[PDB]
Design a protein around this nucleic acid. Structure first.
Lengths: 215, 222
RNA sequence: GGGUCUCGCGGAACCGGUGAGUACACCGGAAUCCAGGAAACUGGAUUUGGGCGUGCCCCCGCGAGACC
């Protein structure tokens, strides 16, 4: 029966210099044909450990692997910011080659308050018939942040989406963009556009705003 | 050293066909095995097929049995994935990966960067590229922020560089979001010294290969 | 007692690694035998053709039949 690799934990958060431990339980005896991969977001997975304990050439020594029967363990002895990634076990004992479900390792660091910016819609876009208002939250930690748009003190709902970056490989921060979408018609009905950011490293919420029409 | 380059992915209607290619260099595939591994967006890794050229043997995951055939051309040193009767669950990045078993046994020791296969009845559409001009009032501490809004494109992906590759420090290109319309829209932003706004020209270079849409957008203060 | 084809019988085990690209060239663990110890072992001497996700192939040797 198709060997099933059961990987835990699903995700964890750890500080720089900490020991991260990821485990993988083969359902039916792969002997040592277990490999460990690091996949940074949107990049190709990279082989770290093969044959359950052999450190692949080029990989730093803080990565290691062990086997105790069907229980396989990847260990990062001193976690570094660039080790932010998803890690996978795989067995290559026999086809189908099966992978663990993955472990998302997040780096925990000090609180960083966001830097906030607001961008009015371009005159070029206005001509097309729609208005996009963008708020940027730059280089903050932790990821939990609340962004609310106000249009002449009226709060907006259902007309905005957020997108968040992946954790930075050097300073472990996130960045966030909020995009408010109005009709040209609606955009030209109001004057004050405001982005109100709440986050842990901000003592009180920060507002960035513009008045429609500022050369 | 060793390289793998996937190609041939893109947008296909349900039931459609697609033929992936994997171009290998730095090694002869006749002395290795080549695998296809796919990653549905936001999910994990799933092996689908492998081929060993100096054995002819092919192996397939049950999820692709009969619809996919893996093949190789030793003279061209490339491998192929032929996908028939595609379905929405086949939407994924398809990675190409190398393994050996006789000389060493190191798993999939090298991976390509993947090609995206999107199965949808929606059509190809090129983005609108609008500038995000540095606020005319003020910014954060001697540093300004500006960017580019890449709106209403399909399918993924698009590329955004700054200043024809000269500007990388401080860039955030956000991950796309599917708007309610069913089209993607992202922004790329960069922080720069405020004193550069009158001395450095910032252009974002947007390339949406599915629709052959290349925009070089100048981002100026308003 | 020779040369060529076909058939038959063969060419220690395990785990790594290095150059080569074919089916080769290597380096280590190690194992085997002997001696010793209660002992994981310790000495001494010796030791295996190769390719490739692996059940097929290359090479080599011996035998048999056919052809010279």
């Amino acid at each position: 029966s198709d060997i099933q690799m059961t990987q835990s934990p699903s995700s964890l958060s750890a500080s720089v210099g900490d020991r991260v431990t990821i485990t993988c339980r083969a359902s039916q005896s792969v002997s040592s044909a277990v490999a460990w991969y690091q996949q940074k977001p949107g990049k190709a997975p990279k082989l770290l450990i093969y044959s359950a304990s052999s450190l692949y050439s080029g990989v730093p020594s803080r990565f290691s692997g062990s086997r105790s029967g069907t229980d396989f363990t990847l260990t990062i002895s001193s976690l570094q910011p660039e080790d932010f990634a998803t890690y996978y076990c795989q067995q290559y004992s026999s086809s189908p080659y099966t992978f663990g479900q993955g472990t998302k390792v997040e780096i925990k660091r000090t609180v960083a308050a966001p830097s906030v910016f607001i961008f009015p819609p371009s005159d070029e876009q206005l001509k097309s018939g729609t208005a996009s208002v963008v708020c940027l939250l730059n280089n903050f930690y932790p990821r939990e942040a609340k962004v609310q748009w106000k249009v002449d003190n009226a709060l907006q709902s259902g007309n905005s989406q957020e997108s968040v970056t992946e954790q930075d490989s050097k300073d472990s921060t996130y960045s966030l963009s909020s995009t408010l979408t109005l009709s040209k018609a609606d955009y030209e009905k109001h004057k004050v556009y405001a982005c109100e950011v709440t986050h842990q490293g901000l003592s009180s919420p920060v507002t960035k705003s513009f008045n429609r029409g500022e050369c | 050293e060793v390289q793998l380059v996937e190609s041939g992915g893109g947008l296909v209607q349900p039931g459609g066909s697609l033929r992936l290619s994997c171009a290998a260099s730095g090694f002869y595939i006749s002395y290795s095995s080549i695998h296809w591994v796919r990653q549905a967006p936001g999910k994990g890794l799933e092996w689908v097929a492998s081929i060993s050229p100096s054995s002819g043997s092919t192996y397939y995951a049950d999820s692709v049995k009969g619809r996919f055939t893996i093949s190789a051309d030793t003279s061209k040193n490339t491998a192929y994935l032929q996908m028939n009767s595609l379905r929405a669950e086949d939407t994924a990045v398809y990675y190409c990966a190398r393994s050996r078993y006789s000389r060493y046994r190191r798993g999939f020791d090298y991976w390509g960067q993947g090609t995206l296969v999107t199965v949808s009845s929606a059509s190809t559409k090129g983005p609108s590229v609008f500038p995000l001009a540095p606020s005319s009032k003020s910014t954060s501490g001697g540093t300004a922020a500006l960017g580019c809004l890449v709106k209403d494109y399909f399918p993924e992906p698009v590329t955004v560089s700054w200043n024809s590759g000269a500007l990388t420090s401080g860039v955030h290109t956000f991950p796309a979001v599917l708007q309610s319309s069913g089209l993607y829209s992202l922004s790329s932003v960069v922080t720069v010294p405020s004193s550069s706004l009158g001395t450095q020209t910032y252009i974002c270079n947007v390339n949406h290969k599915p629709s052959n849409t290349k925009v070089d957008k100048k981002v100026e203060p308003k």
